């Protein structure tokens, strides 16, 4: 188990004609969770919104409308012609299919702008000012400014540029760093696809 498996695993996220399926989609974000614990990481106690998340979605898949959640433009439809999201302010419908993967959707961008500036860094990067630039780029306009001035002060107890390339468990540094331009780009169109999928129906703005 290591990070390359699960960057490839989103390649099953995507079937023949470009929807992305739930199961794998699920799958793909246990993977994520337990290498984010793997991290010896004051940030792990955002793995349990996560989970919480990952189980909202899943008894959606088990429930008796189990074929709506087949994808997320399944699930869209679904919701959205069923009136089962709270397109305005938070009402009836605060765990939405559709509002729940937002968040995750989001949270999925942030991780490859960060892996990315992981990638195409000078060897002596710091790592907190790396994850700033991420941040500030995907979540921070969705986060209140406590919020915000705080997570910048956890972004220091994050190891160094080196520390994170080993722990993906590839090997050195400069062999990390090559399987991250080459296991990226799944998850970039599984990114690329739910975000224009999400954009179609004026859906980036769920609360
Ligand atoms: C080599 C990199 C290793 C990192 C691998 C991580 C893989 C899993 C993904 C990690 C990033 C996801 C972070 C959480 C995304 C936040 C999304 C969000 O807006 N959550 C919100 C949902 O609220 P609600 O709608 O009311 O239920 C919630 O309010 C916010 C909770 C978390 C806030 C903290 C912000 C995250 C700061 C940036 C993430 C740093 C990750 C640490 C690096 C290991």
Same mark, same amino acid.
Request: hydrophobic share 40%; with cysteine.
């Given at each position: ?24 989609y ?35 898949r ?11 433009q ?14 305005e302010?938070?009402?009836? !419908? *605060?765990?939405?299919?559709? %509002?729940? &993967? ?5 949270? /999925?961008?942030?991780?490859?702008? #960060? @892996? $990315? ?25 969705? !986060? *209140?400014?406590?919020?915000? %001035?705080? &997570? ?5 107890? /994050?190891?160094?540029?080196?520390? #994170? @390339? $080993? ?25 690329n696809?739910?975000?224009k ?11």
């Amino acid at each position: 188990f290591n990070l390359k498996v699960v960057l490839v695993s989103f390649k099953q996220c995507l079937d023949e004609k470009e929807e992305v399926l739930l199961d794998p989609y699920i799958a793909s974000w246990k993977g994520l969770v337990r290498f984010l614990n793997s991290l010896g990481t004051i940030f792990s106690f955002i793995s349990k919104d996560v989970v919480s998340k990952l189980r909202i979605m899943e008894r959606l898949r088990g429930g008796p409308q189990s074929e709506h959640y087949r994808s997320l433009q399944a699930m869209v439809a679904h919701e959205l012609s069923n009136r089962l999201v709270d397109l305005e302010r938070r009402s009836h !419908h *605060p765990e939405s299919g559709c %509002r729940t &993967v937002l968040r995750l959707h989001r949270a /999925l961008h942030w991780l490859q702008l #960060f @892996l $990315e500036g992981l990638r195409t860094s000078p060897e002596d990067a710091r790592t907190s000012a790396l994850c700033a630039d991420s941040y500030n780029a995907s979540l921070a306009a969705y !986060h *209140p400014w406590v919020v915000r %001035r705080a &997570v910048t002060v956890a972004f220091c107890t /994050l190891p160094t540029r080196e520390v #994170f @390339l $080993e722990a993906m468990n590839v090997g050195p540094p400069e062999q990390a760093v090559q399987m991250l331009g080459e296991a990226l780009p799944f998850i970039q169109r599984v990114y690329n696809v739910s975000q224009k999928l999400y954009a179609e129906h004026s859906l980036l703005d769920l609360p």
